[PDB]
Amino acid sequence: DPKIVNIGAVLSTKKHEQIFREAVNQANFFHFTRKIQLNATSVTHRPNAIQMALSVCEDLISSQVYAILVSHPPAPTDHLTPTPISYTAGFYRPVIGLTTRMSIYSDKSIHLSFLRTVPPYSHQALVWFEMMRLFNWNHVILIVSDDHEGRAAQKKLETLLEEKESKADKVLQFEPGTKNLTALLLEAKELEARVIILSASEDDATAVYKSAAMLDMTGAGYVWLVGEREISGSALRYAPDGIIGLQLINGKNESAHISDAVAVVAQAIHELFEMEQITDPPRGCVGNTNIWKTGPLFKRVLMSSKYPDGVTGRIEFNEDGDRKFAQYSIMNLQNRKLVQVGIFDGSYIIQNDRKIIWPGGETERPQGYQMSTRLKIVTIHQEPFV
Amino acid sequence: DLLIKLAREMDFTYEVHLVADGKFGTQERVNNSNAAAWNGMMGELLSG
Amino acid sequence: PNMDIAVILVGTTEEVAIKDVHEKDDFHHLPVTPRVELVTMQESDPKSIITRICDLMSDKKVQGVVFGDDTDQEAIAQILDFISVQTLTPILGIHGGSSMIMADKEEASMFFQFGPSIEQQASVMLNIMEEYDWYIFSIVTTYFPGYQDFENKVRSTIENSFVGWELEEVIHLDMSLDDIDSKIQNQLKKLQSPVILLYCTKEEATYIFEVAHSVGLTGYGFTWIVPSLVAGDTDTVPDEFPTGLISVSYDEWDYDLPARVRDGIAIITTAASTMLSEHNSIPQSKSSCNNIQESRVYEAHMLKRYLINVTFEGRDLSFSEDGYQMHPKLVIILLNERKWERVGKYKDRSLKMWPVFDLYPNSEEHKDEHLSIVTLEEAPFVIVEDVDPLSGTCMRNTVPCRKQIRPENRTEEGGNYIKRCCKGFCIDILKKIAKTVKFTYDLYLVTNGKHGKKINGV
Amino acid sequence: EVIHLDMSLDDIDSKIQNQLKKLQSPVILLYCTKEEATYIFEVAHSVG
């Protein structure tokens, strides 16, 4: 009889668990199984953190699982993030993300054995770099909030611009929760650079649209480059018609992430059980003090996975265990509607037959981003000189 | 007079401004609060 | 009021000789009266931790949770942070898995540990490299999370101080692939500095030292320096580690555990009493486990302002804004029978080098004994100047010259040692010939007897 | 400095390599035999 191996997963509704259990049954059929037998074991998101931890230690850890999946809590608000859940497997050394968009998971300190197959917001900044390849930009302004996402996006944008190419001017920071931000628009307007790149949440982007709207800063020459959290919800009616936006392909109902997830994990099990020691996880969280010796090795096998003929496209991990060859879609607000003007497959940006409309009523992007003839002169205070 | 000569030899607009104090490169040597500093002078050209 | 302070102890150590503390009853001058409730735990698992914290919380209304173990698993400490997500209780780390640092934590959590951050360890390494006159250095860092602030801290520190440092290049090594394409050796073969820093982990340091054993960086003239998270436990001493590895770490020797618990209870009780003594208004105690939607509004962050500047017994035993101790008791150990032996104690800002000789190269062979030099404050030959109180250390080539005086208190003498800085022609010539012939010496003055003369007949 | 090398035992204590790593000159002379020159060039090929 083949060895009964269990796989842990953290999903939301029952339909996703049905797709998971079906994906395990298909994984036991399309793959040659001669000594192992995959088992489907998934739970649901609990509104209580302690009940969730006891649910993992008495449902997932008690069944001796190797790989554990995670999605997102089905809640309209945000107050209890599943990040502490990733700490559970941290006690036993791997968690794979599916809908995690925050860049906080990109670090390896609190997320040692944590890998995700979804491009976060920082990768979107890479797409922004591709924008610098379209119209050949130079001086840009990055306006982010004062948190971990702004620091991660700042270090990412600074890492991308490490050669002798284009540089940064001034990065503006603000506390998430302050409406009076007129000084940011005054100092940003006084600067010669006009390329404004906003990357915040909804309540902050609304304050940027209101404060920037009551000062007449949406005319010609001003460029607004945002992501996905600035053209959804209440921050859509305040955005100017013609702002460059983004849209992730297949945002809701990602069955391909579950199927391809069970495919990659199944490949890592059928391929991992073909070397030799391969220890077993302990039984539950009772009377277990030792850690797992097969941690960085399992993460290494999960990271070294290639699927050029996958459902989502080309599954490939990088040095941090994130998702490569992302698939986005450059959108544009036209007449209070989001009209598709471009798509991003992974390598280059492909535009359709729709012309890009600028918020300042312009239709053609000039060569120079900003030019004038005003030169500021400063000097010291000396009697014979000045 | 040099600013007028360079202003008439080149087609542009100028605006002379007087600077007050703080002309030493900002040598952050005094223990402030054990934090991280940043270049705010030295060259003196990029304030705003 | 009697506030409950539970002390969780994890390990096989008998708690009978640990819970017996006599620093109570008489030491209750504050209006609030705390009480110690120490518990044991023989199973290291998150289920038992959450079980004892929730059951102990619902059973006894505690206020300050003091956790302490003796393992080497920092992830468990992160689990303690999870407890804050359900309690926001100031957790203090004294020893064990809660001893390691963790950069970029939660701004709403109250996790405070006694682990030295990279900024303090970097300053200690720069002080050690500064006292021994090590200007040229080579920094070796890997892909460990926390190297940007390290290289920017070293560069930003040497680009402002008056000491003339010399940075060759900070290289980077990869561990995901073995050194088979001749790249790591090519990056390590261009290091000609008398001191080389290392910033990585343990299994990576074994490979870096394994390749460096064949490249040629673990011998005479070169000296590697690792922080605290690289060496780890001092009991496990492998073979690839060469002789002479100056590493900084925690003392965990003379500092007794009951003193750590007493300091923790003093900090929790003091910080919990400053708000009552100043604001004169304190909320209620902690609620049960899942009952957080009702007690989530009673929590106040003002106590955080009382968790930065804390004084006790005169010493500056405070913390910082990141959540770590301001002045950690650090120790410097050197690897020789291949055993980590202590050589100096870095306190406040000064470094003490007493249980070891001041000269770094041993004399077991090369030269033997030493030489003492005594002179007198002469006009153009020996200029003696008092040490500046702003730093307390002679600068440049000013030789630190001590002075042995005796305070003549009426009919009783003493023994004061006042250290000053000497400089002049004699210092110049003796330093030029001393650097050429390469020997250790000393320098001091005369306080009684001056120049030799005849007395009666001697 | 004119260094001296002893050929009687395999370099396992890291001493000959430490004597050869301190050679910062555009021209290096060698005075030995053949089987010793193969080992000196063998280690020097790894030193740089």
Curated annotation (Swiss-Prot), chain B:
Residues with glycosylation annotation = 11, 31
Cell compartment(s), UniProt: Cell membrane; Postsynaptic cell membrane; Postsynaptic density membrane; Synaptic cell membrane
Function field: Component of N-methyl-D-aspartate (NMDA) receptors (NMDARs) that function as heterotetrameric, ligand-gated cation channels with high calcium permeability and voltage-dependent block by Mg(2+). NMDARs participate in synaptic plasticity. Channel activation requires binding of the neurotransmitter L-glutamate to the GluN2 subunit, glycine binding to the GluN1 subunit, plus membrane depolarization to eliminate channel inhibition by Mg(2+). NMDARs mediate simultaneously the potasium efflux and the influx of calcium and sodium.
Family as reported in the entry's similarity comment: Belongs to the glutamate-gated ion channel (TC 1.A.10.1) family. NR1/GRIN1 subfamily.
Subunit and interaction comment? Heterotetramer; the NMDAR subunits are modular and harbor tiered domains that function in concert to regulate opening and closing of the cation-selective ion channel pore. Forms heterotetrameric channels composed of two GluN1/zeta subunits (GRIN1), and two identical GluN2/epsilon subunits (GRIN2A, GRIN2B, GRIN2C or GRIN2D) or GluN3 subunits (GRIN3A or GRIN3B) (in vitro). Does not form functional channels by itself.
For domains, the record's comment is: A hydrophobic region that gives rise to the prediction of a transmembrane span does not cross the membrane, but is part of a discontinuously helical region that dips into the membrane and is probably part of the pore and of the selectivity filter. The extracellular N-terminal domain (NTD) is a site of allosteric regulation to modulate overall receptor function.
Name of the protein described by the UniProt record:
Glutamate receptor ionotropic, NMDA 1
Q: Supply the source organism for this entry.
A: Xenopus laevis
Curated annotation (Swiss-Prot), chain C:
Q: In which tissues is it expressed?
A: Detected in oocytes.
Could you tell me the superkingdom of the organism this chain comes from? Eukaryota
Q: List the disulfide bonds.
A: 54-289, 394-421, 401-422
Give the comment on domains: A hydrophobic region that gives rise to the prediction of a transmembrane span does not cross the membrane, but is part of a discontinuously helical region that dips into the membrane and is probably part of the pore and of the selectivity filter.
| Glycosylation site positions | 309
What's the name of the protein? Answer: Glutamate receptor ionotropic, NMDA 2B
Compartments, record wording: Cell membrane; Postsynaptic cell membrane
Native species: Xenopus laevis (African clawed frog)
Q: Which gene encodes it?
A: grin2b
Write out the similarity annotation.
Belongs to the glutamate-gated ion channel (TC 1.A.10.1) family. NR2B/GRIN2B subfamily.
Q: Which residues lie on this side of the membrane: Extracellular?
A: 1-458
The residues listed in the UniProt record as binding Zn(2+), with positions renumbered to this chain, are 95, 252
Q: Indicate the quaternary assembly.
A: Heterotetramer. Forms heterotetrameric channels composed of two GluN1/zeta subunits (GRIN1), and two identical GluN2/epsilon subunits (GRIN2A, GRIN2B, GRIN2C or GRIN2D) or GluN3 subunits (GRIN3A or GRIN3B) (in vitro). In vivo, the subunit composition may depend on the expression levels of the different subunits.
From Swiss-Prot, chain D:
Species of origin reads Xenopus laevis
Q: In what tissue types does this protein appear? A: Detected in oocytes.
Q: Where in the cell is it found?
A: Cell membrane; Postsynaptic cell membrane
Its domain description in UniProt is: A hydrophobic region that gives rise to the prediction of a transmembrane span does not cross the membrane, but is part of a discontinuously helical region that dips into the membrane and is probably part of the pore and of the selectivity filter.
Report the function annotation for this chain.
Component of N-methyl-D-aspartate (NMDA) receptors (NMDARs) that function as heterotetrameric, ligand-gated cation channels with high calcium permeability and voltage-dependent block by Mg(2+). Channel activation requires binding of the neurotransmitter L-glutamate to the GluN2 subunit, glycine binding to the GluN1 subunit, plus membrane depolarization to eliminate channel inhibition by Mg(2+). NMDARs mediate simultaneously the potasium efflux and the influx of calcium and sodium.
The entry's family comment says: Belongs to the glutamate-gated ion channel (TC 1.A.10.1) family. NR2B/GRIN2B subfamily.
Give from-to of the shown chain within the full protein.
196 to 243 of 1448
The protein depicted here goes by the name Glutamate receptor ionotropic, NMDA 2B
Q: Which gene encodes it?
A: grin2b
Quaternary state and partners of this protein? Heterotetramer. Forms heterotetrameric channels composed of two GluN1/zeta subunits (GRIN1), and two identical GluN2/epsilon subunits (GRIN2A, GRIN2B, GRIN2C or GRIN2D) or GluN3 subunits (GRIN3A or GRIN3B) (in vitro). In vivo, the subunit composition may depend on the expression levels of the different subunits.
